Design an enzyme around this catalytic site. Structure first.
Site, PDB file in Angstrom:
ATOM      1  N   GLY A  46      34.097  39.773  31.253  1.00  0.00           N
ATOM      2  CA  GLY A  46      32.948  39.199  31.930  1.00  0.00           C
ATOM      3  C   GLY A  46      32.717  37.727  31.648  1.00  0.00           C
ATOM      4  CB  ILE A  50      32.418  37.322  36.761  1.00  0.00           C
ATOM      5  CG1 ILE A  50      31.381  37.407  37.885  1.00  0.00           C
ATOM      6  CG2 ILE A  50      32.450  38.642  36.011  1.00  0.00           C
ATOM      7  CD1 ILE A  50      31.820  36.716  39.151  1.00  0.00           C
ATOM      8  CB  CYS A  51      34.425  34.190  32.128  1.00  0.00           C
ATOM      9  SG  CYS A  51      34.645  35.173  30.614  1.00  0.00           S
ATOM     10  CG  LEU A  52      36.871  39.446  35.575  1.00  0.00           C
ATOM     11  CD1 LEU A  52      36.932  40.857  36.140  1.00  0.00           C
ATOM     12  CD2 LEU A  52      35.972  38.581  36.439  1.00  0.00           C
TER      13      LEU A  52
END
Lengths: 377, 75, 147
Positions: free
Chosen positions: B75, C84-86
């Site tokens: 996330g 969102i850096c997923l």
């Protein structure tokens, strides 16, 4: 011991007859506010014979003793001014991994050669007069200064994800689903222009029999060919004072040490520009944490910084202008988790979750154990 | 029985297992055949993530079941 | 290399789309895409519509795109700004991945929120402690905003 050999090399370099200073004193006066303008006005006109004399620096309207400290402060200001990305000369390799490199867009200026020759003269003056800058370039830059061949692994220092993708292409096969071909699209002031790695390159698709040549051309173009004229001017300016037969006894790390001294991470700035969630400055887990960070060696502090933020490099202006994955995100300390669990780190948000331990020994043990797998400096 | 896995790049993997076989055994076979550690393996079946300590039949897995390898959540 | 690939991705989406999520250039700028995600029917976000902005870096496909939500969602892994850096888009990216795989991963994330990356610690705590309250809050938010 690395340090002893480096000291031997430094002594041998500074004992050479072609790197000996004279006795006459050159007074260089610069105003504190307009450091860059006056520095470029004076330095870019000095003769090579003049630049070899003793460097005496006096800021305007500031009379004082200990000219060594004044000169060191002047070089610090000049290095943080000319190498600042906002000046459109250098740029960070990536926003979340701060590494300076020559900006390809810098060619937009009518004459970038004068500015980069001035930068070369400044670096040569810093090395020549035993004064340290404080910038931190990428390893390919130093490997270029020493004229070393550049390979694929060198892209790891510049950009991690780019190197991972290139290694993926090297390892796994490439199909026609990937619409890759010998051309690079670069966005220069809005408009995107296409550069051909090889002649008629936009009409050649990279099969499984070309991906090696494609990787070679991509690495060469990314690291070298995009910054030919500017770096040629910079290296000419640098070699004006320091002959290239002298720089070629170091390597990509000893030269970095020579330019910037022993790299260290300041703790006062770190403490002054951090924020806490569910924590207060008077909480025990914070004062113990800052005492531990005070009485720690630089390697372990760098390891902790890489464990928390994700990289061991800092912006040009300390922790104030610190960027996260999405934007500006200063170092954050948060009370999350159970006592038994080790401290955790959210790298994309520069967050360190430290549970509420009970004594400084316990905090030290947990924090040292939780960063063992990390490598710093 | 035999099951099929679709990876990130489109590669199709065939696995010879049984419904009574545990998730640990299936993940071990997948790691042996591919090298991907079981912890980093995120196989989605019927829109649900399988978990260790159970068997394939515990997730209503049948003959020629299709699994999708997806990316772990950060996330 | 950064335009033929995007044209191929758009053509592939135009032939066999996921039939639920959609993508398209905003006006005429191939490096700025709008995306629409239908809320999964088996999760509390059911019946909602979500909008995403996708920016393709010039280093595509070597460097992953940047995706940002536009409509607020009560999620343990989506912050107020909706980022969102997923790892599919920051660490586990390979050239073989397309833009449809990213949308599928996000639509799967909208059903299995991550508990161990508490991007919103309050929401993560509610999720870990009071599951019924967490789901009720998620449905309240979905009715409030996603319409």
């Amino acid at each position: 011991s690395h340090m002893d050999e480096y000291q031997r090399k430094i002594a041998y370099m500074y004992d050479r007859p072609e790197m000996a200073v004279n006795d006459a004193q050159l007074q260089l006066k610069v105003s504190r506010a307009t450091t860059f303008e006056d520095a470029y006005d004076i330095i870019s006109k000095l003769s090579v014979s003049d630049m070899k004399k003793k460097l005496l620096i006096r800021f305007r309207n500031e009379d004082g003793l200990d000219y060594g400290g004044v000169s060191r402060e002047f070089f610090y200001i000049l290095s943080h001014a000319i190498f600042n990305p906002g000046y459109s000369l250098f740029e960070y390799a990536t926003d979340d991994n701060y590494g300076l490199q020559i900006s390809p867009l810098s060619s937009v200026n009518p004459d970038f050669r004068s500015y980069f020759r001035f930068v070369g003269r400044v670096m040569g003056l810093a090395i020549y007069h035993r004064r340290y800058l404080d910038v931190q370039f990428v390893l390919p830059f130093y490997k270029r200064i020493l004229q070393k061949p550049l390979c694929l692994e060198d892209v790891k220092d510049v950009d991690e994800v780019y190197y991972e993708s290139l290694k993926w292409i090297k390892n796994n096969d490439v199909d026609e689903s990937l619409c890759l071909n010998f051309s690079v699209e670069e966005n220069r002031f809005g408009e995107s222009v296409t550069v051909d790695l090889i002649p008629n390159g936009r009409n050649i698709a990279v099969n499984n029999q070309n991906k090696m040549n494609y990787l070679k051309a991509l690495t060469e173009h990314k690291l070298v060919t995009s910054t030919e004229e500017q770096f040629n001017a910079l290296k000419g300016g640098l070699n004006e004072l320091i002959p290239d037969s002298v720089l070629q006894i170091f390597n990509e790390n000893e030269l970095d040490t020579l330019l910037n001294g022993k790299r260290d991470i300041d703790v006062q700035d770190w403490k002054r520009f951090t924020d806490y969630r569910s924590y207060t400055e008077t909480d025990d887990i914070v004062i113990w944490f800052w005492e531990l960070l005070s009485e720690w060696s630089p390697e372990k502090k760098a390891k902790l910084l890489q464990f928390a933020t994700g990289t061991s490099r800092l912006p040009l202006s300390g922790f104030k202008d610190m960027h996260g994955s999405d934007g500006p995100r200063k170092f954050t300390i948060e009370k999350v988790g159970h006592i038994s669990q080790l401290p955790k780190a959210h790298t994309c948000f520069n967050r360190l979750d430290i549970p509420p331990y009970n004594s400084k020994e316990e905090l030290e043990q947990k924090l040292t154990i939780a960063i063992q797998e990390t490598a710093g400096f | 029985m035999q099951i099929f896995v679709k990876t990130l790049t489109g590669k199709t993997i065939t696995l010879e297992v049984e419904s009574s076989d545990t998730i640990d055994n299936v993940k071990s076979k997948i790691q042996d055949k591919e090298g991907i550690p079981p912890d980093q393996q995120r196989l989605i079946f019927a829109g649900k993530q399988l978990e260790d300590g159970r068997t394939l039949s515990d997730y209503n897995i049948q003959k020629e079941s299709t699994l999708h390898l997806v990316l772990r959540l950060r996330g | 290399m950064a335009l033929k690939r995007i044209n191929r991705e758009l053509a592939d989406l135009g032939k066999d789309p996921p039939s639920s999520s959609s993508a398209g250039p905003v006006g005429d700028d191939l490096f700025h895409w709008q995306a629409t995600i239908m809320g999964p029917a088996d999760s509390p976000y059911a019946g909602g519509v979500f909008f995403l902005s996708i920016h393709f870096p010039t280093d595509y496909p070597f460097k992953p795109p940047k995706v940002n939500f536009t409509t607020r969602i009560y999620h343990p892994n989506i912050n107020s700004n909706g980022s969102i850096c997923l790892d599919i888009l920051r660490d586990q990216w390979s050239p073989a991945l397309t833009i449809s795989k990213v949308l599928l991963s996000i639509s799967s994330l909208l059903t299995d929120p991550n508990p161990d990356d508490p991007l919103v610690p309050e929401i993560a705590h509610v999720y870990k402690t009071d599951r019924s309250r967490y789901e009720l809050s998620a449905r309240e938010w979905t009715r409030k905003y996603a319409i």
